Scaffold this active site. Structure first.
Site, PDB file in Angstrom:
ATOM      1  N   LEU A  63       0.933  -1.182  -0.185  1.00  0.00           N
ATOM      2  CA  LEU A  63       0.037  -0.075   0.041  1.00  0.00           C
ATOM      3  C   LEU A  63       0.942   1.394  -0.008  1.00  0.00           C
ATOM      4  O   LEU A  63       1.829   1.360   0.928  1.00  0.00           O
ATOM      5  CB  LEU A  63      -0.971   0.178   1.188  1.00  0.00           C
ATOM      6  CG  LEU A  63      -1.813   1.207   1.685  1.00  0.00           C
ATOM      7  CD1 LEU A  63      -2.765   1.596   0.568  1.00  0.00           C
ATOM      8  CD2 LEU A  63      -2.482   1.048   2.886  1.00  0.00           C
ATOM      9  N   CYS A  64       0.701   2.247  -0.924  1.00  0.00           N
ATOM     10  CA  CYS A  64       1.374   3.259  -0.854  1.00  0.00           C
ATOM     11  C   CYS A  64       0.728   4.526  -1.493  1.00  0.00           C
ATOM     12  O   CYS A  64       0.133   4.314  -2.697  1.00  0.00           O
ATOM     13  CB  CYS A  64       2.719   3.131  -1.857  1.00  0.00           C
ATOM     14  SG  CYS A  64       3.861   4.523  -2.030  1.00  0.00           S
ATOM     15  N   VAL A  65       0.706   5.614  -1.068  1.00  0.00           N
ATOM     16  CA  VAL A  65       0.283   6.931  -1.664  1.00  0.00           C
ATOM     17  C   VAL A  65       1.374   7.686  -1.879  1.00  0.00           C
ATOM     18  O   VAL A  65       2.223   8.009  -0.818  1.00  0.00           O
ATOM     19  CB  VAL A  65      -0.823   7.533  -0.733  1.00  0.00           C
ATOM     20  CG1 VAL A  65      -1.367   9.065  -1.100  1.00  0.00           C
ATOM     21  CG2 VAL A  65      -2.019   6.560  -0.959  1.00  0.00           C
TER      22      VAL A  65
ATOM     23  N   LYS B 171      -5.059  12.949   2.523  1.00  0.00           N
ATOM     24  CA  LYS B 171      -6.289  13.166   1.876  1.00  0.00           C
ATOM     25  C   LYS B 171      -7.177  12.148   1.636  1.00  0.00           C
ATOM     26  O   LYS B 171      -8.159  12.326   0.954  1.00  0.00           O
ATOM     27  CB  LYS B 171      -5.905  14.020   0.389  1.00  0.00           C
ATOM     28  CG  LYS B 171      -5.071  15.032   0.481  1.00  0.00           C
ATOM     29  CD  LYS B 171      -4.514  15.296  -1.009  1.00  0.00           C
ATOM     30  CE  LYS B 171      -3.402  16.536  -1.052  1.00  0.00           C
ATOM     31  NZ  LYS B 171      -4.275  17.811  -0.726  1.00  0.00           N
ATOM     32  N   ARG B 172      -7.039  11.149   2.486  1.00  0.00           N
ATOM     33  CA  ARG B 172      -8.238  10.061   2.623  1.00  0.00           C
ATOM     34  C   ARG B 172      -8.293   9.091   1.367  1.00  0.00           C
ATOM     35  O   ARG B 172      -9.335   8.668   0.825  1.00  0.00           O
ATOM     36  CB  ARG B 172      -9.385  10.566   2.912  1.00  0.00           C
ATOM     37  CG  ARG B 172      -9.562  11.529   4.090  1.00  0.00           C
ATOM     38  CD  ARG B 172      -8.673  11.323   5.457  1.00  0.00           C
ATOM     39  NE  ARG B 172      -9.576   9.819   6.080  1.00  0.00           N
ATOM     40  CZ  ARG B 172      -9.066   9.367   7.286  1.00  0.00           C
ATOM     41  NH1 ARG B 172      -8.111   9.779   7.755  1.00  0.00           N
ATOM     42  NH2 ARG B 172      -9.836   8.292   7.588  1.00  0.00           N
ATOM     43  N   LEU B 173      -7.026   9.028   0.359  1.00  0.00           N
ATOM     44  CA  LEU B 173      -6.748   8.226  -0.562  1.00  0.00           C
ATOM     45  C   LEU B 173      -6.671   6.706  -0.202  1.00  0.00           C
ATOM     46  O   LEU B 173      -7.351   5.828  -0.777  1.00  0.00           O
ATOM     47  CB  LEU B 173      -5.817   8.959  -1.572  1.00  0.00           C
ATOM     48  CG  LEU B 173      -5.643   8.204  -2.865  1.00  0.00           C
ATOM     49  CD1 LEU B 173      -7.020   8.209  -3.834  1.00  0.00           C
ATOM     50  CD2 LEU B 173      -4.557   8.746  -3.639  1.00  0.00           C
ATOM     51  N   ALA B 174      -6.117   6.561   0.884  1.00  0.00           N
ATOM     52  CA  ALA B 174      -5.800   5.211   1.332  1.00  0.00           C
ATOM     53  C   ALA B 174      -7.268   4.381   1.606  1.00  0.00           C
ATOM     54  O   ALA B 174      -7.161   3.255   0.949  1.00  0.00           O
ATOM     55  CB  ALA B 174      -4.800   5.041   2.457  1.00  0.00           C
TER      56      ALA B 174
ATOM     57  N   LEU C 111       6.409 -10.197   2.909  1.00  0.00           N
ATOM     58  CA  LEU C 111       7.569  -9.535   2.100  1.00  0.00           C
ATOM     59  C   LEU C 111       7.488  -8.163   2.350  1.00  0.00           C
ATOM     60  O   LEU C 111       6.508  -7.424   2.746  1.00  0.00           O
ATOM     61  CB  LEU C 111       7.202  -9.969   0.662  1.00  0.00           C
ATOM     62  CG  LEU C 111       7.662 -11.570   0.411  1.00  0.00           C
ATOM     63  CD1 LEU C 111       7.325 -11.692  -0.924  1.00  0.00           C
ATOM     64  CD2 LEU C 111       8.748 -12.293   0.868  1.00  0.00           C
TER      65      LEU C 111
END
Ligand SMILES: CCCCCCCCCCCCCC(=O)SCCNC(=O)CCNC(=O)[C@H](O)C(C)(C)COP(=O)(O)OP(=O)(O)OC[C@H]1O[C@@H](n2cnc3c(N)ncnc32)[C@H](O)[C@@H]1OP(=O)(O)O
Ligand SMILES: CN1CCC(N(C)c2nc(N(C)CCC#N)c3sccc3n2)CC1
Ligand SMILES: CN1CCC(N(C)c2nc(N(C)CCC#N)c3sccc3n2)CC1
Ligand SMILES: [Mg+2]
Length: 411
Positions: A159-161, A168-171, A411
């Protein structure tokens, strides 16, 4: 306190986690037909993108996002730099689902903004041994055993923004879309790990490190010289001497794993992993994929004497960018992967891991205190670090377990 995680089917507190006796789902039963066909809504300036993680150029685009924006320490000294070859390995195991690789791009000019990835895993995740004994003491065995069968679930990672889009609440949107795509394939649980504390882990383990190139580790500030070494005329010379290793492996009959070893490495690994409460089940194809040597990515050795494979170990490589320094740009880390010992003590097997990793130019060996990793910490001169790794399930009630009852390497 958690505007996103309070809406999700995960245990909300430790107190709640304390009342959990039996493994089982948290959400009501649902079907694929109940799950939205259309992608989760996203702002009109963005778009969902499914990279092909077996196509060099799409792996490269995800590799740059993660190189520049994935996990870094709080002092912004090191940032993971998982390689392109590692990412194809990690995200395309047997029977992977391309649709579970989820990215966001900015529509105008196609800038890559975010990523998350799921892969399939077959996981034993039924009620643990100490809670099956409580269930027996109460006359509750059948409900404790309901989910004993290994389950085909999703493992989430990467998981990466992008740093310009943080906070900005994208995750949450990327997690909802990944959940939808997984649920459309009739899978309803996931397992994931993180350093951060979220609601609510079922197990937590400290990280341990074993210095292989202490002079470089000190130069980049991964390590310092411990205070007692100041009592010596040459503190660094003593530190190097402390951590020196043989230049060749000590176990007779150590050699790299080959395709013909796959059935025997599967048998000894599966018999060993059986003993832990949470752990993967691998087919021959998944043993091949995860354990056969791959240059720059995974390194696996078996002990074969008199024609029989009796032990094996594996490690994988994750380099990190060294952000500040002038002498070095990269930290080359070896991570303990799966292993099984039937003929020699575990410390004797894992010493040869350290020897081979040092011979191959790794700077440090890392691990979490899962599996039986605590059994060789002191003799092999590992030390605890400040990090941890917390283990979570999505949509699965589970009692708290010790990390030495976890056999899944993430991993
Ligand atoms: C059945 C199938 C299910 C499949 C899905 C299963 C679930 C999988 C879950 C994912 C497992 C990932 C496993 C790994 O890859 S762990 C590695 C995570 N990646 C990094 O640390 C890279 C560097 N950081 C970033 O890229 C961003 O800071 C990230 C993307 C992490 C958050 O972006 P940002 O900082 O811009 O924030 P926001 O405004 O968008 O969102 C804020 C909300 O996000 C919650 N948050 C923060 N960090 C994490 C985290 N590591 N896991 C889960 N949630 C996290 C946070 O508590 C808050 O929720 P709430 O507190 O308000 O409620
Ligand atoms: C002295 N210590 C502080 C730094 C710690 N360390 C090397 C470390 N490395 C990190 N990286 C990315 C390099 C990992 C390796 N090897 C990260 S990422 C989040 C925390 C974190 N911590 C290890 C203990
Ligand atoms: C899902 N992932 C599992 C492995 C994690 N990883 C390679 C890792 N994480 C670490 N930490 C503390 C958890 C970071 C995250 N998330 C550290 S600390 C020092 C070496 C090291 N290596 C990176 C996240
Ligand atoms: Mg955001």
């Amino acid at each position: 306190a958690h505007a996103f995680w309070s809406t999700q089917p995960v245990p909300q507190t430790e107190d709640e986690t304390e009342k959990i006796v039996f493994a089982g789902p948290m959400d009501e039963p649902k079907t694929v037909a109940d799950i939205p066909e259309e992608p989760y809504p996203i702002a009109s300036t963005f778009e969902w993108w499914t990279p092909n993680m077996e196509a060099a150029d799409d792996i490269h685009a995800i590799y740059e996002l993660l190189r520049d924006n994935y996990v870094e320490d709080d002092d912004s000294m090191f940032r993971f730099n998982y390689s392109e070859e590692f990412l194809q390995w990690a995200l395309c195991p047997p029977n992977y689902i391309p649709d579970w690789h989820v990215a966001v791009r900015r529509k105008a000019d196609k800038k890559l903004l975010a990523f998350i990835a799921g892969v399939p895993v077959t996981l034993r995740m039924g009620t643990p041994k100490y809670m099956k004994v409580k269930a027996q003491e109460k006359g509750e065995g059948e409900e404790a055993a309901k989910y004993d069968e290994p389950r085909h679930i999703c493992e989430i990672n990467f998981l990466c923004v992008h740093k310009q889009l943080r906070e900005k609440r994208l995750a949450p949107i990327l997690i909802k879309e990944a959940t939808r795509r997984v649920n459309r394939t009739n899978v309803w649980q996931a397992v994931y790990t993180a350093g951060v504390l979220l609601p609510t882990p079922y197990a937590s383990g400290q990280y341990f490190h074993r210095s292989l190139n202490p002079e470089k580790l000190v130069e980049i500030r991964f390590s310092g010289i411990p205070a007692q070494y100041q009592k010596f005329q040459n503190p660094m010379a003593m530190l190097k001497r402390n951590y020196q290793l043989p230049s060749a492996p000590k176990n007779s009959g150590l050699r790299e794993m080959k395709p013909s070893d796959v059935p025997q490495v599967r048998r000894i690994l599966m018999n060993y992993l059986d003993s832990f409460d949470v752990g993967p089940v691998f087919s021959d194809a998944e043993i091949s994929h995860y354990l056969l040597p791959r240059d720059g990515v995974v390194f696996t050795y078996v002990v074969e004497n008199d024609k029989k494979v009796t032990d094996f170990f594996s490690f994988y490589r994750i380099p990190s960018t060294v952000i500040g320094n002038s002498n070095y740009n990269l930290l080359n880390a070896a991570y303990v992967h799966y292993y099984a010992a039937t003929s020699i003590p575990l410390h004797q097997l894992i010493l040869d891991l350290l020897i081979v990793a040092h011979s191959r130019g790794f700077d440090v060996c890392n691990m979490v205190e899962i599996l039986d990793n605590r059994s060789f910490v002191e003799q092999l001169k590992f030390g605890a670090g400040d990090g941890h790794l917390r283990y979570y399930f999505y949509n699965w009630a589970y009692p708290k377990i010790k990390p030495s009852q976890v056999a899944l390497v993430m991993l």
